Protein backbone atom coordinates (compact mmCIF):
# COMPACT_ATOMS: atom_id res chain seq x y z
CA UNK A 1 0.00 0.00 0.00
CA UNK A 2 1.36 3.41 -1.06
CA UNK A 3 0.34 6.83 -2.43
CA UNK A 4 3.62 8.53 -3.47
CA UNK A 5 5.54 8.83 -0.16
CA UNK A 6 7.70 11.77 1.04
CA UNK A 7 10.61 13.06 -1.13
CA UNK A 8 13.69 10.86 -1.78
CA UNK A 9 17.31 11.80 -0.90
CA UNK A 10 16.64 15.57 -1.17
CA UNK A 11 18.83 15.66 1.98
CA UNK A 12 21.59 17.07 -0.29
CA UNK A 13 19.52 20.23 -0.86
CA UNK A 14 17.17 22.42 1.22
CA UNK A 15 15.42 25.11 -0.84
CA UNK A 16 11.85 24.58 -2.04
CA UNK A 17 10.37 25.98 -5.30
CA UNK A 18 6.68 26.37 -6.21
CA UNK A 19 5.22 26.85 -9.71
CA UNK A 20 1.94 26.95 -11.73
CA UNK A 21 -0.28 30.08 -11.45
CA UNK A 22 -3.39 31.68 -12.98
CA UNK A 23 -1.97 35.26 -13.32
CA UNK A 24 -3.86 36.30 -10.16
CA UNK A 25 -2.62 33.81 -7.53
CA UNK A 26 0.04 36.36 -6.44
CA UNK A 27 2.90 35.92 -3.90
CA UNK A 28 0.63 36.93 -0.99
CA UNK A 29 -1.82 34.05 -1.37
CA UNK A 30 1.08 31.64 -1.83
CA UNK A 31 2.69 33.10 1.31
CA UNK A 32 -0.16 32.14 3.67
CA UNK A 33 -0.84 28.97 1.61
CA UNK A 34 2.69 27.65 2.16
CA UNK A 35 4.07 29.32 5.27
CA UNK A 36 1.07 27.81 7.06
CA UNK A 37 2.83 24.45 7.20
CA UNK A 38 5.83 26.13 8.86
CA UNK A 39 7.27 29.23 7.13
CA UNK A 40 8.16 30.83 3.80
CA UNK A 41 11.74 32.11 3.65
CA UNK A 42 10.97 33.58 0.20
CA UNK A 43 7.87 34.07 -1.97
CA UNK A 44 7.93 35.74 -5.39
CA UNK A 45 6.68 35.47 -8.98
CA UNK A 46 9.23 35.60 -11.88
CA UNK A 47 6.58 37.19 -14.15
CA UNK A 48 7.27 39.49 -17.12
CA UNK A 49 8.88 42.95 -16.80
CA UNK A 50 7.20 44.94 -19.60
CA UNK A 51 3.61 43.57 -19.66
CA UNK A 52 0.52 43.19 -17.44
CA UNK A 53 0.72 39.36 -17.36
CA UNK A 54 2.94 36.54 -16.08
CA UNK A 55 4.91 33.47 -17.20
CA UNK A 56 2.42 31.19 -15.38
CA UNK A 57 4.60 30.11 -12.41
CA UNK A 58 5.79 31.38 -9.04
CA UNK A 59 8.87 30.72 -6.91
CA UNK A 60 8.07 30.16 -3.32
CA UNK A 61 11.30 29.14 -1.60
CA UNK A 62 11.78 27.52 1.74
CA UNK A 63 14.78 28.06 4.02
CA UNK A 64 14.15 24.69 5.69
CA UNK A 65 13.46 21.45 3.82
CA UNK A 66 11.42 20.11 6.76
CA UNK A 67 8.74 22.81 6.52
CA UNK A 68 8.99 22.32 2.75
CA UNK A 69 8.49 18.54 3.01
CA UNK A 70 5.09 18.79 4.66
CA UNK A 71 3.91 21.76 2.59
CA UNK A 72 4.97 20.05 -0.67
CA UNK A 73 3.40 16.74 0.44
CA UNK A 74 0.23 18.80 1.05
CA UNK A 75 0.39 21.29 -1.88
CA UNK A 76 1.83 19.43 -4.91
CA UNK A 77 -1.03 19.08 -7.42
CA UNK A 78 -3.38 20.50 -4.75
CA UNK A 79 -5.10 22.67 -7.43
CA UNK A 80 -5.26 25.90 -5.41
CA UNK A 81 -7.34 27.87 -7.92
CA UNK A 82 -8.23 25.21 -10.54
CA UNK A 83 -4.95 24.64 -12.44
CA UNK A 84 -3.11 22.07 -10.25
CA UNK A 85 -0.39 23.73 -8.13
CA UNK A 86 3.18 22.37 -8.43
CA UNK A 87 5.72 21.95 -5.63
CA UNK A 88 9.30 20.68 -5.72
CA UNK A 89 12.77 21.28 -4.25
CA UNK A 90 14.54 24.29 -5.80
CA UNK A 91 17.78 22.20 -5.51
CA UNK A 92 19.48 25.18 -3.91
CA UNK A 93 20.93 25.35 -0.38
CA UNK A 94 24.71 25.08 -0.93
CA UNK A 95 27.02 27.89 0.31
CA UNK A 96 28.39 30.57 -2.07
CA UNK A 97 31.83 30.45 -3.72
CA UNK A 98 35.04 31.20 -1.74
CA UNK A 99 33.08 30.10 1.37
CA UNK A 100 31.65 26.99 3.07
CA UNK A 101 29.08 25.95 5.72
UniProtKB/Swiss-Prot annotation:
Post-translational modification here is noted as: Extensively phosphorylated on serine residues in the RS domain. Phosphorylated by SRPK2 and this causes its redistribution from the nuclear speckle to nucleoplasm and controls cell fate decision in response to cisplatin treatment. KAT5/TIP60 inhibits its phosphorylation by preventing SRPK2 nuclear translocation. Acetylation on Lys-52 by KAT5/TIP60 promotes its proteasomal degradation. This effect is counterbalanced by HDAC6, which positively controls SRSF2 protein level by deacetylating it and preventing its proteasomal degradation.
List residues modified as N6-acetyllysine.
Answer: 52
- Give residue numbers for the modification (Phosphothreonine): 22, 25
Q: What induces it?
A: Accumulates in a hypoacetylated/phosphorylated form in response to cisplatin treatment.
Residue positions where N-acetylserine is found in the record: 2
Where are the disulfide bridges?
A: none
- Residues found modified as Phosphoserine: 2, 26
Specify the RRM domain's residue ranges: 14-92
Where, subcellularly, is it found?
Answer: Nucleus; Nucleus, Nucleoplasm; Nucleus speckle
Spell out the family assignment given in the record's similarity comment.
Belongs to the splicing factor SR family.
Quaternary structure and interacting proteins, as annotated: Interacts with BRDT. In vitro, self-associates and binds SRSF1/SFRS1 (ASF/SF2), SNRNP70 and U2AF1 but not U2AF2. Binds SREK1/SFRS12. Interacts with CCNL1 and CCNL2. Interacts with SCAF11. Interacts with ZRSR2/U2AF1-RS2. Interacts with CCDC55 (via C-terminus).
Q: What does this protein do?
A: Necessary for the splicing of pre-mRNA. It is required for formation of the earliest ATP-dependent splicing complex and interacts with spliceosomal components bound to both the 5'- and 3'-splice sites during spliceosome assembly. It also is required for ATP-dependent interactions of both U1 and U2 snRNPs with pre-mRNA. Interacts with other spliceosomal components, via the RS domains, to form a bridge between the 5'- and 3'-splice site binding components, U1 snRNP and U2AF. Binds to purine-rich RNA sequences, either 5'-AGSAGAGTA-3' (S=C or G) or 5'-GTTCGAGTA-3'.
Write down what this protein is called. Answer: Serine/arginine-rich splicing factor 2
Q: Please tell me the species this chain comes from.
A: Homo sapiens
Gene name in the database record = SRSF2
Amino acid sequence: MSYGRPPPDVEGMTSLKVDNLTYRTSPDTLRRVFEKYGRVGDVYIPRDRYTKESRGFAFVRFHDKRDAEDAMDAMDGAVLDGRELRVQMARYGRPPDSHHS
